[PDB]
Design a protein around this nucleic acid. Sequence first.
RNA 1: ACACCCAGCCGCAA
Lengths: 44, 468, 49, 436, 135, 44, 67, 49, 114, 257, 82
Amino acid sequence: WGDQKKAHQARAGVSQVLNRLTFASTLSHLRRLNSPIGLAKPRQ
Amino acid sequence: THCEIHPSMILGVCASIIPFPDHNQSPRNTYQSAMGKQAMGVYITNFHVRMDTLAHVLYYPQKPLVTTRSMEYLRFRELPAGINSIVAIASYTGYNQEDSVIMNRSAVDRGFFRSVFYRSYKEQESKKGFDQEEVFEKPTRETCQGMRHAIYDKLDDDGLIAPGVRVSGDDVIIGKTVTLPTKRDCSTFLRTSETGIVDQVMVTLNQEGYKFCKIRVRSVRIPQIGDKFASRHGQKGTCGIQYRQEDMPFTCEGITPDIIINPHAIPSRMTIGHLIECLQGKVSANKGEIGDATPFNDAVNVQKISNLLSDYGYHLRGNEVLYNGFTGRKITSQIFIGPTYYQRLKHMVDDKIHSRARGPIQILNRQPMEGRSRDGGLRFGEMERDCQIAHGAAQFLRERLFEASDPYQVHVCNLCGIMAIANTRTHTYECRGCRNKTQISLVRMPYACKLLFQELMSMSIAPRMMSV
Amino acid sequence: NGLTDRDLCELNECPLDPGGYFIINGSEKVLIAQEKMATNTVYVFAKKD
Amino acid sequence: DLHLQTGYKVERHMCDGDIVIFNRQPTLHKMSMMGHRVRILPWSTFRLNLSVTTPYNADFDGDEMNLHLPQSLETRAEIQELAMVPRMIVTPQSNRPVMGIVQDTLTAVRKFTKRDVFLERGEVMNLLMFLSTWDGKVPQPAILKPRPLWTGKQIFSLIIPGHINCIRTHSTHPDDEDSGPYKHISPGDTKVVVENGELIMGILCKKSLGTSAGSLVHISYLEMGHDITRLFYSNIQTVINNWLLIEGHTIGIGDSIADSKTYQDIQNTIKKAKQDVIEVIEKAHNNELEPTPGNTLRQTFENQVNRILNDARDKTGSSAQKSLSEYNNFKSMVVSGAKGSKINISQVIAVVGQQNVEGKRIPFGFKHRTLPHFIKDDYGPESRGFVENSYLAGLTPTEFFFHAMGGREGLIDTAVKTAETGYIQRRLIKSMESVM
Amino acid sequence: IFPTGDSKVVLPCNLLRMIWNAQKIFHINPRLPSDLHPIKVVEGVKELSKKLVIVNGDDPLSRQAQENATLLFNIHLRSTLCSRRMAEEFRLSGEAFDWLLGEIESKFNQAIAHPGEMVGALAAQSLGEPATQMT
Amino acid sequence: MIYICGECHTENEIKSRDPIRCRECGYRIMYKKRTKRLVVFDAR
Amino acid sequence: MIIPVRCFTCGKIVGNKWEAYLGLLQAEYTEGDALDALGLKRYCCRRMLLAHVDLIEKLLNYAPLEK
Amino acid sequence: KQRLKGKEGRVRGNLMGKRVDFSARTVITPDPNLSIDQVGVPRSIAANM
Amino acid sequence: MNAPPAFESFLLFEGEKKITINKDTKVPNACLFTINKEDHTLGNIIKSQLLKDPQVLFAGYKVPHPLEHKIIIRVQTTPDYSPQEAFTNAITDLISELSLLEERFRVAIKDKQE
Amino acid sequence: PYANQPTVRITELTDENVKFIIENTDLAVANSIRRVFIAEVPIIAIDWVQIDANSSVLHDEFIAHRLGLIPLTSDDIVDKLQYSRDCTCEEFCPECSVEFTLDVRCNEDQTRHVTSRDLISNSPRVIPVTSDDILIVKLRKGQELRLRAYAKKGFGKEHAKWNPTAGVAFEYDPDNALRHTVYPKPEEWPKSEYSELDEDESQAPYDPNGKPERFYYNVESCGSLRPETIVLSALSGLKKKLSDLQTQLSHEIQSDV
Amino acid sequence: QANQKRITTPYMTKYERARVLGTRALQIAMCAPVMVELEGETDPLLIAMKELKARKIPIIIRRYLPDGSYEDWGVDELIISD
RNA sequence: ACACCCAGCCGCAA
Ligand SMILES: [Zn+2]
Ligand SMILES: [Zn+2]
Ligand SMILES: [Zn+2]
Ligand SMILES: [Zn+2]
């Protein structure tokens, strides 16, 4: 996510390949959140 | 100031399809919500029009008898992911242990959890050179160099496979040959352990205007005894053995179970909701209506379900007398019987099997390559070699890292420790830097260590072989 | 947008498909929402070390 | 060109009887990779023995495991003399056999070993077929007239090889039996004694056949040898499974339902606990709760509430355990020691119990309230994470969400601490790799 | 050496089990008096303990080291194999005692540490396997 | 060599390696017909 | 997808009852009476007819790829 | 320095722990009727190895 | 891909016999039948019919493995009566058993049909 | 020492269900007769199918499986046709198998239901059960299905499509008398269909000298075989298997001596 | 060293047992003479184990003391742990 | 006598 030459500072993990194993899996992958974390406090 | 619209909207898309999740344990709900995405079945209705890699579809999807009010709003009824299965919770033979299951080979022969595995490949005429071009054509035995021993007669004159034919492992499936700067066979090959059937193939033009094609190979997967299965409650299991109908137990009315799950899957990973599912499934299949199993309902508990089942002519706790399939004698305990929803998981026994014997070898490491797709070999890690250090088997641990992985012979001087050149035919062993032609010693030592010490010598470091 | 069940089935597109995914080079891509700290809001924090 | 002169090497296929070695990541200890013998079976999976699943810390739910085939007369012999699972029943970790009967055969030995079980001639008749070390002589039955009946203890005496002497105690051993009379009679049939290779009394359990120090299999290894112990394990796993094929084991709803009097007692105990915690929080509201010395006032209030709710959960678990029948399979699975615990029985039947996050109770994410449904400034049982209901009765959504938090932290801790334990592993073993 | 009354302690070969084996192999009767003279037990223990070698030598330094290493098994052996305990509760016979001495010698010689065994990696793997069970 | 088109379904042979088209619709997606050669399928 | 011909557990004929099941459902009958009228005394075939969803009407809304 | 580095590198990820020929990996399945030392092997693995 | 074809559960290829006789050495007057390519269907019959015989001490059956379609039957009799002829009698009365049952079922069908 | 004297009584002989009672018989004999019902009764079923043209959305494997599990009547000629493996005929012949021809084409707006009635055989004595009909595949306009199918002879051990029963029910000792099952709460269990107790009593009293007998069968055919000839075929197959065992044992004991 | 002044545990441990049983069996595999009479078995492991029981193994074991001085032991004076 | 280059990323298995 960002410029091509600046991939070091570009955040990764955006725009994953859509899962199509299950209709439930598809509806799960459409409605998904993610955290920018690479300590267990934010995981709780 | 506000009221909840309904208490069961807490769950997400995956967690909604679990009925009675309050009766389960939260780690098991988490596991099944993670595994609900792996449950195959029909996924998108135009699956034959579409084609993409790693697509699964199942013969007979069934909406669950035990259902909640929210999977109907996720359109799970239209596109289910499993079959309601008559399940005996029993320790029948011993093949159910460690959460495993016994399935009915008679049912499996009737289409129970049988599925179709669609796979697709694609190739392009990516023209790079002026005359270095690849053209879809049938390769001739002598005009091109990249030969294997596969059957090349299955293709037509266009250079593509005919639909509907049978292809086995290591077969040519698209024939493309690139011309030399006469030609070189740069054709793609079907990957090992497939034995599939081609179904539908198309030709078209890509974004950059040249020819481009896709195929689609389908293979039915009769469930072997390795396939991964789970319920809607976190009931991870693999198929232990497939008995026939005459070998498994049977009720007084003739009901034989489809899947037998071990009774010790219940007490440790507390999945009482699976038992409630089974009871409500029995009463729903006996009654006719579809069971209401919303997560939070004070009008539905175990007592009313038990009374409804007892009204219909069964044991009020869901048990049922079974007879031994082999002996014919009555089982002393009374097995808990009833339909419930299981799912078939993506993880196949045929896709996970792998064997290696001195096959393809990595260009850099001179070692086995990285996994089954490349026909590589298994890793033997640090903690593995430490296991032999604990055992004290030094020569097994030597054979596992030197003789079988990458044996190699080097020539090194005896005055210095620097690796020396050696001509094999003319036998002129001579070490540069010492003018030594009489003391070079053969050393058997791995190629990984040779490349290691050559990377050190690229860093102006001198690892010297003091063999004396 | 706006097509009914019959027009979607005639067009070889699934009516049951919710959509919401891009198509880049024939591969279906979906944007997963990424959380970030809320803007224009004053916070207080206490670093331990 | 297929003539075979002496000195050649022929790479045959892997026939039966060959020696290979299995591995499962992570290899924590030296039990986790070790040798086996090759037996050729149909289908496309590795098929390994059931009690061997305790050394390789595994489960048959999707575990895939590695294979290594030696190719040397040096290597096959040294694996046959070092890495064989018959020779290495016991581990030097804690001088107890991690080779142990587990999951199904143990809880079937428990039901086959009791006094009340009696086999007709047609039952002992088939159970004697599945042996391998049987001498070929049918033992004299314990009952002759009117009809010949064999008890299971003579069968397990036929299982026990040589002359093993062992005295263990069953899990539900009454502590008052040793001091008083009937010390060697044991009306509950506890006090397992094995005399001259003959099982005399007692019901076997985890404390006798499982992975315990001084167990029956441990003495069998330390006296008879290593091959005889392997035959002992194989004979147990054959005959006990094929007796279970007749008698049958299960679990269901009827193993979770308690009596109506039991339910009334559990509800009365829960109501009394809630009234007591309301009383102590009312004492804390009007400032009469004297602080514990060395403790914060909030700390001693939380300690008193936790003590009261833990006493309540202990009492309701004791009542649920006393309400269990003899035919209840939930009780049998935990007295056998095969799987589960009595706390799991209490959580299934009576009360799930107090639920905690990082030691303390459910925190205050909102403005000093756990959930918007509960009133502000509440330190009561329901509002802070206690689950008055059970798994069988169903959970209200608030306590369901608190249990979701408990399961979530139970996933997070075991998902993040493997980084630490794997680094401690590598650090400890790289420094110690050369000590001999 | 031992405070706090921790009587549980690990020793190579379980003495009471071999005494019970010697009882139930030779079919001795605890009711009847036995034929086993006390000094047969005394010099049997004394002549046995000179053949349990750990630090093998003749000079007093190695003798002291062997006594130090063998001391716990010797101090348990003399307590279990006492004359009064044998005469009262064990009631073994002469050939039973001889078989007991020979077979405890065999068990102790089997239980000695094998040279060439890597103790460090085994120790790290043993001490580090409970690292995955404080969860 | 025979081919079948996208929608109007005319069996338009090519045999010339020209760009794909038809005289009825001209939709540039082509499929090939199942061949006259014989294949057997087990019912197991 | 499509109704199976046989029940998975026993093997009673199922494929000749889907049209009859829809016909009895259209004539104001409940699921239990419709299943009883089809002679499905055992619940293994009752769950086969009850819990099966048909997808062929969804699949026959598409234009065929040949003619 | 990155080539000589640790995990997924030369000395830890290529040499001291390495890949080997003559090995197999497969999902595992219960079997009571085999002995402790015995183990089941599929025919394809025994044929290829 | 390692699925065995279904016909080897009861077919016999070229190389093995239907019946093999092994004489047990642990106890006198014993036999080890190794009936190949049947299942518990035959073995339960053999065990029950041989337990019906009074002068047979030991006669039981087991399967070594559910994959290998093989049963083994171990018969021990009194020291005046061979286990092989005991097996022969236990089959030749079984033939009369099944034929009598077939005839009675036939006459029951004939009587029920008017 | 010898065989006993079984008796049979028939309570219901309708067109698709047969209930009979077998008395004075050991448990293993009745269990084996039950096993032979669903595993080793010969029947004619489709095993060899050849697809000529299949434009249906149901692909080749769906149609092959559905056609494989269509029952076929074999009331009289199941004994006449030999097994294909034992036929001296190569591949297939009309004496060793039955040939099926299926040809159907939809050219109408409404959905064409391709059922089992459209299957056409050569021998009139082999036909799917239509004399409701079994659905196979539904076709839209312009979609064809042309195939040829061959029907072999086999029993239930090979595949479940050769299982002739619908479902067999096997009951012995209806009200509990031998304590073969131990009921923890005997009052909570419903009485069996063949029970002989009143409402007050829960179980029969203990019988120490008893032996399992008076077996109740509720065998049910799938419409392929008649539900009364399936028992005769099962008994004949068991008798022929034990006669083969007689021949093999006699050959072995003359070979050893 | 000489016959006297020879100290090491005389119990031939499992590691050199495995090493000898491997090396000598590979010597059968490379067609060496067999020191014991054999009765109808062909596996080199079985005959090597049988002659290890017979204690007629024609190799000696050179044991490395940690000081540096070697120490030679044969097979026939070492006694089997089994 | 086999043919497929590698980095990166992501999902996922126990
Ligand atoms: Zn040099
Ligand atoms: Zn067109
Ligand atoms: Zn059914
Ligand atoms: Zn023929």
